[PDB]
Chains A and B, each alone.
Chain A
Amino acid sequence: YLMEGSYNKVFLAKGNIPAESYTFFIDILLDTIRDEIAGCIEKAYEKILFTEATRILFFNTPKKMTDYAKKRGWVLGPNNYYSFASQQQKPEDTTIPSTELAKQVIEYARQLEMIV
């Protein structure tokens, strides 16, 4: 579940109780899990209600979710509103290529001119 983002992995961190020493240590991972989840949700949606965000990042209270809607920087209207940072400014410039592709062309010429 960790490598290919699938969640229900926070739920199975208290269900891996057959060995208690697992449940003591695994708690550490649960602060990275929230981070990857919000990392995708920053791009995956654009309008959800606040209580749902509280149900997704596995929080129980509204207060926590205010703090974490403040670190990522979202606004608190009736539904929690997003900011477009998925492809905010597109790569519509091949002026950035420009120099690089010209290097490449030159390179081909070197291989067609060298003495081999």
Chain B
Amino acid sequence: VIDAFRLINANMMVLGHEPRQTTSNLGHLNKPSIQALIHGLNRHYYSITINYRKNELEQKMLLNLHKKSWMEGLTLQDYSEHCKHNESVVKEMLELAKNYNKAVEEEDKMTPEQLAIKNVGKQDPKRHLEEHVDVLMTSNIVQCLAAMLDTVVFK
């Protein structure tokens, strides 16, 4: 949020130039400031419009956010830190699984209005088996490639 404003000669407005404070700006409409913009836009100031100038040198500068020549791919988490991770998740899989069977028996015997408003204990449904598998997998696959890649790279 960033606007711009310029006062307008309120005196000249009273004198008949009230429909004569219209400089030719484009437009795009505002509201929540209609508080003081109803005599702001239409008595005290008006709305200028904002732009930017996205240089290519500044853009190639900010674009930087990671120095990776020591980050991933030249590293990999600890292989005893990484089994303790799998352990936990793939057990949570079990807990959620059971509730998943209990949800597939319910949904069958109910109309979508009652499965719609079902927002008590979101732990039951698909949403958490997906939430998991995509972290688990991710991890691991790549978990996966990192080991292999280094075997040839630092061969």
Contact = CB atoms under 8 A, between A and B. Distances in A.
A43 B46 CA distance: 96
B149 A108 contact: no
B34 interface: no
Contact of B141 (A97, A99, A109): A109
B88 interface: no
A108 B141 CA distance: 8
A102 B137 contact: no
Majority secondary structure of chain A interface residues (helix, strand, loop or mixed): helix
Interface string A97-113: 11101100110110010
Majority secondary structure of chain B interface residues (helix, strand, loop or mixed): helix
Contacts of A102: 145, 148-149, 152
Given A101-B148, A102-B148, A102-B149, A95 B141 contact: no
Contacts of B144: 105
Contacts of A109: 141-142, 145
A60 to B, nearest CB: 56
B67 interface: no
A99 B137 contact: no
Contacts of A98: 148, 151-152, 155
A107 to B, nearest CB: 10
Interface string B133-149: 00001000110110011
A99 B142 CA distance: 15
A105 B148 contact: yes
A31 B129 CA distance: 64
B145 A105 contact: yes
Interface string A20-41: 0000000000000000000000
A63 to B, nearest CB: 52
18 contacts: A95-B151, A95-B152, A98-B148, A98-B151, A98-B152, A101-B148, A102-B145, A102-B148, A105-B141, A105-B142, A105-B144, A106-B145, A108-B141, A109-B141, A109-B142, A109-B145, A112-B137, A112-B141
Which 9 A-B pairs rank lowest in CB-CB distance, beginning with the nearest?
A102-B148, A105-B145, A98-B152, A98-B151, A105-B144, A101-B148, A102-B149, A102-B145, A108-B141
Given A102-B152, A109-B142, 6 more contacts: A97-B148, A98-B151, A98-B155, A102-B145, A105-B142, A105-B145
Interface of A: 94-95, 97-99, 101-102, 105-106, 108-109, 112
